[PDB]
Amino acid sequence: MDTFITRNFQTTIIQKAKNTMAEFSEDPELQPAMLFNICVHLEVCYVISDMNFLDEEGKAYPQYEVIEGMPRTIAWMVQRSLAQEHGIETPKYLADLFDYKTKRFIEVGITKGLADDYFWKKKEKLGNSMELMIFSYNQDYSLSNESSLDEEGKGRVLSRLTELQAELSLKNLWQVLIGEEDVEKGIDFKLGQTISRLRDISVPAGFSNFEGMRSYIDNIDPKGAIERNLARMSPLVSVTPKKLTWEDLRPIGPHIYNHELPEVPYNAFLLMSDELGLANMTEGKSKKPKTLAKECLEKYSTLRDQTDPILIMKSEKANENFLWKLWRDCVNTISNEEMSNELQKTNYAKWATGDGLTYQKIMKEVAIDDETMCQEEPKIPNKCRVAAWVQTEMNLLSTLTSKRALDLPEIGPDVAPVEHVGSERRKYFVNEINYCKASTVMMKYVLFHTSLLNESNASMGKYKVIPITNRVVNEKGESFDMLYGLAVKGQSHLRGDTDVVTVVTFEFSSTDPRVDSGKWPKYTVFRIGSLFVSGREKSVYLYCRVNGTNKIQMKWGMEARRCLLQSMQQMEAIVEQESSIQGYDMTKACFKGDRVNSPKTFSIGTQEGKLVKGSFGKALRVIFTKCLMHYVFGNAQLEGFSAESRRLLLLIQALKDRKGPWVFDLEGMYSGIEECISNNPWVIQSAYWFNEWLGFEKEGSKV
Amino acid sequence: AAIDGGDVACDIIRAALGLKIRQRQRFGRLELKRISGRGFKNDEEILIGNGTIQKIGIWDGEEEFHVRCGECRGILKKSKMKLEKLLINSAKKEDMRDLIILCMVFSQDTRMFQGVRGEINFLNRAGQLLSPMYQLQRYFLNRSNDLFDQWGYEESPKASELHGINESMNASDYTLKGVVVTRNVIDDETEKVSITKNLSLIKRTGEVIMGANDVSELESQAQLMITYDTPKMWEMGTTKELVQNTYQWVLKNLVTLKAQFLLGKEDMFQWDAFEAFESIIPQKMAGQYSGFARAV
Amino acid sequence: MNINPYFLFIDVPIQAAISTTFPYTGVPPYSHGTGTGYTIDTVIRTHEYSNKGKQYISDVTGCTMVDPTNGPLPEDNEPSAYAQLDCVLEALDRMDEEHPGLFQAASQNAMETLMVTTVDKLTQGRQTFDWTVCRNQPAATALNTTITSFRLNDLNGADKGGLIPFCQDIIDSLDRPEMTFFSVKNIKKKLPAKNRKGFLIKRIPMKVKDKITKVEYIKRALSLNTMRAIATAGIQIRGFVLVVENLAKNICENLEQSGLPVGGNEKKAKLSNAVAKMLSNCPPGGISMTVTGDNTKWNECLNPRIFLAMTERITRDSPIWFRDFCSIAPVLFSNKIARLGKGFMITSKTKRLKAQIPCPDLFSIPLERYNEETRAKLKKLKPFFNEEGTASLSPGMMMGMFNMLSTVLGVAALGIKNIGNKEYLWDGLQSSDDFALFVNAKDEETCMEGINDFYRTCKLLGINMSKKKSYCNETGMFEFTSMFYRDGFVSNFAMELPSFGVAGVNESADMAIGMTIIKNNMINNGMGPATAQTAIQLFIADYRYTYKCHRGDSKVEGKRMKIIKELWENTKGRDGLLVADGGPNIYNLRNLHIPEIVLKYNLMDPEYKGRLLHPQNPFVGHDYDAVSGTHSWRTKRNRSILNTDQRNMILEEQCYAKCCNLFEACFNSASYRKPVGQHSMLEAMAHRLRMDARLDYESGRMSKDDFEKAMAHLGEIGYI
């Protein structure tokens, strides 16, 4: 088909048809029949307007103005100008040709059958406001006015179309030739009574029927209406511009400094800085989690065989006995021989997670009749002050440990300079954050959530024991299989994915909770035994906690591995900005330093109230830890606070660059930000750090 | 030797090996052939638009050059801070784009100096600061609109074959001052040149004809499977290829390695192959790796 | 050393520092619950900002209607939905004059596209509210159900194929006195199931016919159901909104101010070009200011009547039928009825009980039994509530349904460029929710006077600028749709990142889809080389985990890994093996658009090439780019219930349970001894009993008498 199009027509005609039809906002390839029709129509109208010419008085020796082919905007404005200059009605459809003699717009068309019916239906479509000439492949012609075209033009057009018709059937193209009326089948659209009434009752105040609105829109000249409306508008409608200044900015959410409010609890799913993995060196083979947990407990047999618990702390509502018996059942199941990791002593599991205390649903009619059934008030989040453990979390998760848990596959050889730059950036990033404790915590988190999601494949009405395991590698190359504790997941009879399935997790730790009583108001902790590392006894506690999460939360935890890409993108944006200051890449220079440049240093934190600098590696580690904490501590409060602190930070930046920022309703922004600082540890610590950094910027801007 | 090919790197290698090369000055992609006039070199400080001062050896005196770059030809007139007149022929747009931009940079026109906005601290592959002229060359090659706007335009000559050109090499009455097109194409034999430590070609009288910074950075893959023997350059290949090559070298001469090892000296851990192999070893653990290997 | 991450901002510009703060461009799982309470609050707020308008009673749907257009102008900075028609018409006139021949061309193109389009286009969409069952269903299923109901009601628009006949039949169906349709009804179960009693209860659906009066169907069609979109619209509205949005997109494409449908680095080019253009024509010695404005309650203030006025003004010179077709959508929206969702939940702690109150019975209980906020919300919503658990909602836009028209209105607001012929000129960009405004004047005082005039003007058009989320600064640094621009540098706030796991089609298809997703992320969202390479690494890891196709030279063990290791041992061209076969990955930035088969063809083993690309292999049998080989297999996709009538009538007879019980013993005594493959279960039983009798006699469990007795009975069966 397309070959016929490019062979039977000149390149200019094909290009004009293609660019005029591509404005339909659709694929021009899969439907080329209309392309052929439009090309033939363009050729016909071009031929029609190449033989007859006019003069100062109208000597026949141009007379035809071509509107099709040109851009629709230019064509429409030209048609409107012609109609205005000639004092004639403008056709509602874009006429394909205009005549200077008759002072009327005209249309052309191509068909396959008799042209009389086509002409009559086109007349019905356009009424009598436009003239037409029509030709058909089967030697038929129709003209509204016999004084429109001469014999030469009609004969040439007829010969061309007859030749095209004859040639089409030679390559089996006439069979697939679509007609012309199909593209304009729908021209009748009559509204029913109901829809007409709905339209009539949907007009702005001041009109009775939609006819009045239509006439008002099509007739009235509203020039100058905006000024008239604005003149009488009250002066009270003002943005109230206010130039911003350094002193205008104030600390956000000072209540967090109120010592009366309680400390923020530790609501993260898994222990991050207090983890304790029972290392068990392995060759490197992959084994089922149950076998790994069994071997790890066998190595530390003393902890496994602990039956008398030395309770150290208790939650407000949880029962220590039930949790301990559930943990004993979990370890018994882990240490058995059956392949399945399914609990068989469902008693304590059922009675420990409060799975039997759920209310029973009754028919709505009884509730309506009943008077004691009333909606319960929403438990709005409490308000808490600064929690000192978030600072320790951030400090420790950014340190370099002796083990790494990242092993990514390989990539093809790098050739292009951009590939070399990307590979260098990746090398520096991984080298910097390979052993960072945040990476290991992130891997544990994602692996545990993946296992939780997998266990929900077919087991939904049964309790499943899942060990919190991890695969780690050290500098020497020997790889270990760490076990961080266990967790039993309950049943979710409902098939919904956003339905909480209660899971209770027992994680080992080496930190005595009594040191920070406010850090664990939600944990039940025992003391199982004592490990020896360098001949010295260090205690081991078992933090037992009930929790509730849904399948979508499992998916979120699984995707929590995106913190790596997030941190890499942030570092790459920093490097791209540094390189954009210059004209060349700044990766090695800002990491290691070249002859011209020096190793870039970033302000990391505070030491005894004084600023401290550090290498770009420390900044990368802090960025990764911040991203991981943001993902782990994520709730609606955190995202809202970040979204509003965006605006506050942008205003501060504008202030720094001496751009003279102006604020309209500053207190509105401050209220929007403070609306989200209620109980999230990450949000509260972010507010504290923002206040500290704002103070530092204020005190440093006076120099 | 057989092929009279290459642009710059081939000439440098030929001179290093002591072969016959063509005689023509180069300023990167732009090769020059002085036809008339002479000038002297004087070192002094100049002010750039961005507002920094750096010493430069400028050439003062009337000079006429047979400027060429790629396929397009032309002639250049150069004096102190002024681009008197420049004539070019018809070719691919980017060809004369590079030719004319390099002509601006080489003419040392004060307008070109004032046409710098950003920092020009560009580094080379070796990590050494580029010469100021090459720094401006690279900056303007990456930044062409700024210089073209800063230069200023004028009316084109009324000659039939002479017409102007815009920033995008579009013929127009407004043409870059001293720049014109011409349909009268100008027509486009070997000597020996000495070389120095820094891979810079210096003629018999001592003028520099081709530096080490004129090598085009256009990386590409050879159409033929070239082979090399020296291990000093194995680092260019991927890590697996480097390991394969070094282990092949170790294995093939294994008898000599064993014989020297049995002697117990330390000269057998410093072979060129081992120096090439060391590159792929991480710096932090390299010392421990070597210590453990020596101990075992 | 207490870390302080914010200190990074000291050494880095904040625009770069906060780059990619949110890894997710979609929706989190912990967002405030969007249930009945949220939709009630939304309708309350929509009616609150327009309560000074004209309140009346619809004579068609019999619901309360509020019309704020041409209402009193605001006397306070609070959000207002009172948009004067004259100001909107004048703004459209100014836009048309500035861009001559734009409205006519856009309307012509939209009408031509509508003429050439087909009903199937409606199937490309998110969840759609099906009215026959009154739920949320896929677009294809909703369209099919609507077509079937129309056919039952003597409406055959889909038969003609065109979209115009379909919409004509929709508006005609809006006129039938009684509408009959199909619906799905669930009935409990009594069929056996082995848990501990061979008996289980479940729900089985059946198709039934239901009729609804005219008013009921009218209300149902206008209903907006709720599942950051807040609600979805049925099929009766989809075609008209599609046409109107196509028109608005045609207009916007040629509007330099419009920020849509730009995508990719073109967005950065538009941003930088706008900044440069505004700075270039700044008055000599004047000041240029930039506002990163935001709009509060954007869709809770725009009125469908104003959109109707805009559509009428745009299509002022167009065929009357097309004008009506364009107008059918705004009028449908002006009568939209919201559905409040599931309902509330009330509990009694003393008796440990809870119950769910559905929307129709929202007011069936005293308001004192609801908490304070719900009590107040119901008290305020009482006037705009219907007895059928739906709320009348004339104003508002319930998030994005006329985003293109919203952008057109914003561009119209930005096109005035002056009020009172003062010494300020404004312009900027806007994409359907957010606008960046650049104003050039002499001094900052005049710039702020111009900003105030623009604020008042947009108030007159119903657009409410956010004073609590907007700021102004010297031009050169600003934000536009989560894209920070700063003196040439450009950064992103939230970037979508590849999700864990493979696409979910097959080995080669999954690899191709992953690579093309990475390429598209690089092209559009601006992912750096290092980030893209790390994404490639992560995708390869996930792919290998999912398909158990680790490297052939690895030391992992698996059912497929033994054959992979053998192939790796037997193969010479180990660089040519595909990743799915444990080969080495070679993908990188330069070759992210080349299928791996094409990449590795030159290195593949010719025998391996023949085996992999065998023209007739049993796996392949009968967007993205890949190669059709033995790795393009298809997974079994056959589930659910077919032969519904026969199975239902069999299960409803009686004796099915006895047949199952007899089947269970014999065919579960062994794990698998079933001559499956369409064998009649009676035939399989006959064969099984014959073999059991043979084995019993051979081992001596039965005497010859029992043997012969069994063979006679089996002789009567017919398979012996």
From TrEMBL, chain A:
Plays an essential role in viral RNA transcription and replication by forming the heterotrimeric polymerase complex together with PB1 and PB2 subunits. The complex transcribes viral mRNAs by using a unique mechanism called cap-snatching. It consists in the hijacking and cleavage of host capped pre-mRNAs. These short capped RNAs are then used as primers for viral mRNAs. The PB2 subunit is responsible for the binding of the 5' cap of cellular pre-mRNAs which are subsequently cleaved after 10-13 nucleotides by the PA subunit that carries the endonuclease activity. GO terms for biological process: cap snatching; DNA-templated transcription; symbiont-mediated suppression of host gene expression; symbiont-mediated suppression of host mRNA transcription via inhibition of RNA polymerase II activity; viral RNA genome replication; viral translational frameshifting. Its EC number is 3.1.-.-. Phosphorylated on serines and threonines by host kinases, including human casein kinase II. It is found in: Host cytoplasm; Host nucleus. Mn(2+) 2 binds at residues 68, 96. Influenza RNA polymerase is composed of three subunits: PB1, PB2 and PA. Interacts (via C-terminus) with PB1 (via N-terminus). Keywords: Cap snatching, Endonuclease, Eukaryotic host gene expression shutoff by virus, Eukaryotic host transcription shutoff by virus, Host cytoplasm, Host gene expression shutoff by virus, Host nucleus, Host-virus interaction, Hydrolase, Inhibition of host RNA polymerase II by virus, Manganese, Metal-binding, Nuclease, Phosphoprotein. The keyword Coiled coil does not apply. Belongs to the influenza viruses PA family. Its main location: host cell. Pfam families: Flu_PA (PF00603). The keyword Phosphoprotein applies. It comes from Influenza B virus (B/Memphis/13/2003). Mg(2+) 1 binds at residues 41, 96, 107-108. Mn(2+) 1 binds at residues 41, 96, 107-108. This is Polymerase acidic protein. A motif (Nuclear localization signal 1 (NLS1)) lies at residues 112-127. InterPro entries: INFV_PA (IPR037534), PA/PA-X (IPR001009), PA/PA-X_sf (IPR038372). Mg(2+) 3 binds at residues 68, 96, 107.
UniProtKB/TrEMBL annotation, chain B:
It comes from the Viruses. Residues 22-227 form the Influenza RNA polymerase PB2 CAP binding domain. It is found in: Host mitochondrion; Virion; Host nucleus. Influenza RNA polymerase is composed of three subunits: PB1, PB2 and PA. Interacts (via N-terminus) with PB1 (via C-terminus). Interacts with nucleoprotein NP (via N-terminus). Plays an essential role in transcription initiation and cap-stealing mechanism, in which cellular capped pre-mRNAs are used to generate primers for viral transcription. Recognizes and binds a wide range of cap structures of target pre-RNAs which are subsequently cleaved after 10-13 nucleotides by the viral protein PA. Plays a role in the initiation of the viral genome replication and modulates the activity of the ribonucleoprotein (RNP) complex. Belongs to the influenza viruses PB2 family. This is Polymerase basic protein 2. It comes from Influenza B virus. The chain holds residues 301 to 600 of 770 of the full protein.
UniProtKB/TrEMBL annotation, chain C:
It is an enzyme of class 2 (transferase). Keywords: Eukaryotic host gene expression shutoff by virus, Eukaryotic host transcription shutoff by virus, Host cytoplasm, Host gene expression shutoff by virus, Host nucleus, Host-virus interaction, Inhibition of host RNA polymerase II by virus, Metal-binding, Nucleotide-binding, Nucleotidyltransferase, Phosphoprotein, RNA-directed RNA polymerase, Transferase, Viral RNA replication, Viral transcription. The gene is PB1. RNA-dependent RNA polymerase which is responsible for replication and transcription of virus RNA segments. The transcription of viral mRNAs occurs by a unique mechanism called cap-snatching. 5' methylated caps of cellular mRNAs are cleaved after 10-13 nucleotides by PA. In turn, these short capped RNAs are used as primers by PB1 for transcription of viral mRNAs. During virus replication, PB1 initiates RNA synthesis and copies vRNA into complementary RNA (cRNA) which in turn serves as a template for the production of more vRNAs. This is RNA-directed RNA polymerase catalytic subunit. The lineage of its organism: Viruses, Riboviria, Orthornavirae, Negarnaviricota, Polyploviricotina. Mg(2+) 3 binds at residues 294-295, 433. Mg(2+) 2 binds at residues 293, 434. GO terms for biological process: DNA-templated transcription; symbiont-mediated suppression of host gene expression; symbiont-mediated suppression of host mRNA transcription via inhibition of RNA polymerase II activity; viral RNA genome replication; viral transcription. Mg(2+) 8 binds at residues 434, 479.
